[PDB]
């Protein structure tokens, strides 16, 4: 250790305290998870279904793409409805039509507002009070509810079949015809849908708050944000602004003038080390990064196609094979794979450069095995998803081989274990290069310690996804899944990137190593403080209680703090272009890392915070504001990191290859301005129109085909094409650029 | 001009565009102001009251302290209810009791939720649809409403009298017994109360939105934030975070390295110029600053006393003479006077130092006349308010001599003209010192131009308060009043301060003058951009339409941007302590200006933004979050500025007088930590408990005696005493310190 004990003990302290909050409120997530009533029975006494049928329905839902086909509890895809909200609304409306007929022999819609208000009050009384027995033993539905449920089951049985009545709906929902062709599976699935709506609509014992924290916004049962949601929402903003103001104050006042900026080396240091065999073995990883990235981008276009034409594509019904659910899955899964691969490549490039520019024994071996391991996992998983969504996949294999139905962990459990083994194997290849450099009785090993930590965090924190299986409770799946998607990606990828950059720039002699170790420990602490408990900003409405929402709100506020100030970091890293004339070769990677800062600030920070205070998210969860954020944050940050890192590794593994300034201006500006156009001209306007709808009418309405198929939204969804094309141009330029680079040095190992 | 053309044209552009938005949406504020129906009649045809009675009631309300005694449309004092919300709730509940009796011969409270829901639906139908005729000609009340109104009039007739039934309420409301002793005036006043509740509860023609933008939160008539409110609220946060992120990005990338830091002079430059006669004439202004400040602080304690014991003070009923309404008025009015005087003194100290350390002819004259002019205005206004609140003041003199009843412009119109004439006269004394320095055919006159602009902005933008008279529509009063309180204080005082500091530090040779002119033009643009349209964040619910709320929300978001980054500015100004050994003499003033930055960030920025997005404010307007902000922002920023400036002028006009490091550590830390304790241990917890109540039940409930008199709130109101005392200690230390200073070397503290 040495001059960074404080920054270390602060990181450890942040980790300790944060994983306390995450792990403790993890016990409260498990405990307060909406019961799955062993038995759902009508009051008349007839057994409707039970746990096993709700869970069987979870698996059927999984098998069809789960969260890749609309949403549950506001998690998943956005073209189909939130099934919970849609179900809730359809069941409550069915109930109200039965209520209204019983009491007035007119339908609810036919009644005067006062009759309607009284019905709504009886609906609310019934639905909100409809807890299962103690031990979540038996849920009795009133016969009206049992009936509402029966006729809501009927509706979804038709929607998820080939039933021509609901063809327009499937088109509008980018559902393939016969999404879920087994009638039993569809029935079971409706049980699952029921259960989520039920949870959504049932107050927790001795609360005014549903198991989903009154999610979704369903005025009919007085699902409105809790007052606590509203509390923590205001607190989050204060936490955020306090946090920024104090961070800037701390930084302004606790820098200490800063010193030690030696002249940059004469020669790029990283060009002094000869490419190890395992470093030249990364061309194919760079290929895979751009291949998957280009694939991914096309899959977004394919996905985006279905949001404007749910089924045909020049009159061939592509949805039979490549439905929205599949291409959305692939779109997301491919994003992860190519981003991960960028990072994995970045790391593997560094590993042998960390043990003094020499390969650990069998590092080229491992770098080639790891590569095919990843391609296997990608092809297998993708095939698995195809087969899951095609409904070829035996239901009882679906979760292993098919589609977990959980967004970002969609790949079958087998492939997920493959991916984990891959990433663990990469942990070994990294540590093969980093352990010697740690065990060498030498100088400042603190950046490298932070890196090996980062590397082990990547290495192992993807195994958080094995704490849920197929029939695990959504709330528990949700808990663990957001370890992966939020903690492992948005946290441990960040720190590994930031640490690997700090390490590269320090190694390049652009930054002292003190300045790097210090910068990257302080960053670690900054990101992890908000990051780690910020996992909960995904679990507000996932069957979780208000504490989870408090932690999530407040700590997600803290997570924005370091993002919003990234203007300064960005400039610090961009400054490095001028430190040495050879930094012109790292121009583009450096432009990426500035785009990372930019999008971290805007995408992750601004658009993450837009949707983060429970009260905002309460309404906008599962609206187009998420994909705004998701695009801006995942691509803008980790995509540009991965590409930046791609271009960096390319700079070194094709050291004579000069990037085309034109191609890279197109690649870089196409991506940046494509991404801004997608967000600002399509996704964000839509998310806001939907936010309006969600707030005005309810979540069901914001997600509803009638609403989603209105002309403004059709035009805004069509207008996405501009940004999508500007972006595909950029992505194409980037893909070509890297391909040309790779083809400029042995075209037959890529 | 010269190297600052861009920064100038940007300031002019910001001013142009901003005063466009303010002046344009000012036409929309006038046009969309809730009608005052010429006639209010029962449907049965009986004339209840009219315009003249509502306006007469406005004057009666004014006469009793207006906004210094609870709130109208969430503007005013917080110990009494919001009368609009309280009235609305009492009338709607009365209506519901009449409804419930008509239909069920039980009271609303006695009915089942469904009956209650149906009644609420009929209430909502009636109240929301209850527009006046076209031309705001006649408002017909349903006889039930006419009755609800009659029995709500009765309640307030009793509350505002000596009626022993409502004694506990008056105590809880810090209302004096016989607050409004004329029965007619009270009746008229209830008409006014009615009208505000009516506006609050009536949808605008062809909207779902009341004249007050559904304010207050009154679930009974589906007064909930508009979807637009909710829209602009999310946009504001995005505008804010985008704004910070981009500002930091712009700053990070568009600084240009920065150069020209000459060695600080050897001798304090300002000690080289001999004190002009008009500068020594400022001791008494410094006295008045601390006298009013100490008075003000005691008045806060007196005010705070009434929030825990509405009437007695060791068993003598002080409320007969010095009721909460009076001492709150004085508390606020004194704040303005001593803060203004700080600035006016600061300016007058600079005036002769700007025309080369020599007094314009008759500057000592003017500085003495201006002083007694201010003391006259302070004593007269204060006497006026006493007499208004005592109800001695003839009602028809009340608005001229008494109490305008509008917060921060409470002083009678005469005194307000006095204050304006004073500030205009100060404009002349400033320009007496600044015009020569501008007309001298010389070098860089751009800071001094920005200063003379700032000075003219102070000089004239207080005359915005003469665009409303006594019987002016609240919405129009509100429009103009917030020019004064928000624009003139929170905008033109800021820029004058910042410019006068830039000017002082530049004159001291601590900053280039380029760096000053540049810093202070960029600041001007930054503050004015958000500041000026941010006036509207006061008018969201004041009878204004959604555009006003959009502008207000978005531009108030922009106004936070420069505040949150002030950590950096603060450090830049604090840096100056080290530039010259003689800056030890300006240590404390510099500590003030850092406290200004701190509180600008936290008080104005964090706590201003806490309460700023229409959706937050919708619920928290008139809750203890405002006084948190108001204390932290007005004292923390302008109070410390004024005191900073006080200590600075003291440093020079008592140039041999050394400040007591102990006294000033107590003064400074007592104020800072007193202010933090007041906010964090009392006001903020309360505001949040009330926010909870406001969101859960409605504004009426959050402001209601039952709620406000709960034990937690009693304890939190009592616990204020800690911070109040720590603060009074600080203030006392500061007052003594300045007194001792003034009493040193020829004692001149008039
Ligand atoms: C590695 C990181 C440590 C965090 C582990 C948290 C897992 C939560 C387990 C959980 O929810 O238990 C139900 C009752 C469970 C509470 C578990 C508390 C974990 C504290 C973590 C301390 C980290 C330092 C299964
Ligand atoms: C060298 C590279 C090879 C490394 C291979 C690692 C594979 C381990 C994965 C196991 C997941 C088990 C899922 C069944 C469900 C019950 C809970 C099970 C929890 C197990 C996960 C533990 C974390 C991962 C280690
Ligand atoms: C109210 C207060 C707020 C103030 C608002 C001000 C708005 C203006 C914001 C920023 C402007 C400053 C940026 C200047 C950079 C110039 C550097 C330069 O010439 O270098 C070149 C490469 O640029 C680079 O350094 C590379 C940058 C590329 C990465 C960024 C991606 C952005 C794309 C987003 C499209 C919407
Ligand atoms: C807030 C909106 C409404 C405005 C309120 C305040 C109005 C009062 C007057 C303001 C500006 C007066 C400046 C006059 C002196 C400048 C001209 C002069 O003699 O100096 C020149 C050099 O130019 C210079 O020294 C540079 C000339 C810079 C001109 C700036 C004009 C001010 C615009 C308003 C900015 C707040 C010689
Ligand atoms: C040396 C000192 C010299 C300066 C002295 C200035 C003092 C006199 C001016 C005061 C104006 C008071 C007008 C109030 C009368 C009512 O309806 C309503 C609208 C009617 C419009 C009223 C016009 C107000 C003018 C405001 C001033 C411009 C900012
Ligand atoms: C200098 C920077 C300042 C900005 C903030 C940044 C640092 C601190 C961060 C903030 C998070 C801590 C505050 C969380 C407490 C929230 C607890 C909560 O939800 O309860 C609220 C708040 O009341 C309360 O109990 C009041 C909470 C007290 C808040 C002030 C804390 C100061 C000490 C009251 O709710 P109730 O009305 O009791 O609801 C139940 C109805 N009977
Ligand atoms: C032309 C480029 C792109 C297009 C047209 C596109 C389109 C889409 C579409 C249509 C969706 C689904 C919205 C829905 O659920 O109905 C989506 C989701 C997503 N896209 Fe993209 N995409 C593009 C690029 C990218 C890139 C480059 C990344 C990351 C590398 C990415 C990551 C994602 C993610 C993570 C989701 C899931 C978002 C969420 O659930 O909020 N996309 N995209
Ligand atoms: C680079 C950093 C980040 C990345 C890569 C990232 C990525 C994502 C992605 C892909 C999603 C969509 C997840 C889903 O479909 O269910 C998401 C959702 C979300 N993110 Fe981020 N994020 C980042 C930072 C942040 C920050 C800083 C915040 C808030 C402070 C935040 C808050 C959220 C919230 C609240 C959601 C949920 C939206 C919803 O449930 O519909 N994220 N994030
Ligand atoms: C010991 C010090 C202080 C105490 C105990 C105190 C107390 C109070 C109280 C009790 C209120 C009225 C809350 C209500 O409406 O019921 C109030 C309002 C106010 N105080 Fe103070 N005060 C203090 C210091 C100051 C100082 C130093 C300033 C400015 C120089 C100031 C400015 C104000 C303002 C502007 C209001 C009106 C606030 C609003 O309506 O939101 N106070 N104060
Ligand atoms: C130093 C700068 C500022 C000062 C001196 C200041 C002062 C005040 C004062 C004294 C109040 C209470 C007014 C009243 O009683 O009706 C107030 C209210 C308010 N301020 Fe500020 N303020 C400042 C900056 C800001 C900022 C930066 C924001 C938001 C971006 C803001 C937003 C508000 C809002 C929304 C209210 C209304 C609260 C309510 O109506 O109950 N202010 N300000
Ligand atoms: C500052 C951060 C900004 C983001 C966080 C703000 C989140 C917004 C809070 C939403 S309040 C929401 O508004 C709703 C309507 O606008 C209101 O709900 C009601 O209103 C309907 C009128 O259309 C009414 O018919 C329904 O009974 C009901 O849905 C209510 O304000 C709440 O749901
Ligand atoms: C960033 C800061 C955000 C500030 C804006 C705050 C957001 C306001 C949205 C709250 S919606 C509002 O909440 C109220 C309760 O919290 C709701 O109350 C209602 O339903 C509740 C039972 O479900 C209960 O309180 C009452 O029975 C009933 O009046 C209210 O209708 C709802 O719109
Ligand atoms: C409007 O929906 C869309 C398509 O189908 C109609 C596309 O094919 C395309 C074409 C471009 C790509 C990225 C495949 C885009 C952009 C798209 O979003
Ligand atoms: C001592 O008791 C109290 C008062 O009178 C009842 C106050 O004046 C005040 C104000 C504080 C001072 C300086 C006594 C508060 C808050 C209080 O609790
Ligand atoms: Ca999703
Ligand atoms: Ca007030
Ligand atoms: Fe997240
Ligand atoms: Fe304001």
Residue numbers in the entry:
A (entry chain A), B (entry chain B): 1 to 750
Task: Copy the relevant paper text.
Here, we report a high resolution, 2.2 Å, structure of AxqNOR. The overall fold revealed 18 α-helices packed together into each monomer, with residues 113–122, 227–255, and 564–571, creating the dimer interface. In our structure, the Ca ion is ligated by seven oxygen atoms, OH Tyr78, O Gly76, OE2, and OE2 Glu407, single oxygens from propionates of heme b and heme b3 and a water molecule. In the map presented here, a weak density corresponding to a non-protein molecule is visible away from the transmembrane domain close to Asp724 and His305. We propose that the density in our map likely corresponds to an endogenous electron donor that was likely carried through from the E. coli in which the protein was expressed, since no such molecule or analog was added during sample preparation. Residues Glu309 and Arg720 are hydrogen bonded to the ubiquinol ligands His305 and Asp724, respectively, with a critical Arg720 also making a stacking interaction with heme b, positioning it favorably for electron transfer. Analysis of our cryoEM structure of AxqNOR and that of PacNOR(7) has highlighted an attractive alternative route for NO entry, which is also compatible with binding the cognate partner protein CuNiR during turnover (indicated by red arrows). The conformation of Glu490, the gatekeeper of channel entry from the catalytic site, is different from the previously reported structure. Here, it is hydrogen bonded to the bridging hydroxyl and W2, in contrast to being previously directed into the channel and hydrogen bonded with Glu5599.
Quinol-dependent nitric oxide reductases (qNORs) are considered members of the respiratory heme-copper oxidase superfamily, are unique to bacteria, and are commonly found in pathogenic bacteria where they play a role in combating the host immune response. qNORs are also essential enzymes in the denitrification pathway, catalysing the reduction of nitric oxide to nitrous oxide. Located in the cytoplasmic membrane, NORs reduce the NO produced by nitrite reductase and catalyze N—N bond formation in the reaction 2NO + 2H+ + 2e- → N2O + H2O with the formation and release of nitrous oxide (N2O). In contrast, qNORs are single subunit enzymes (NorZ) which use membrane-bound quinol as an electron source. Whilst cNOR is predominantly found in denitrifying organisms, qNORs are also found in several pathogenic bacteria, where the enzyme detoxifies NO produced by the host’s immune response.
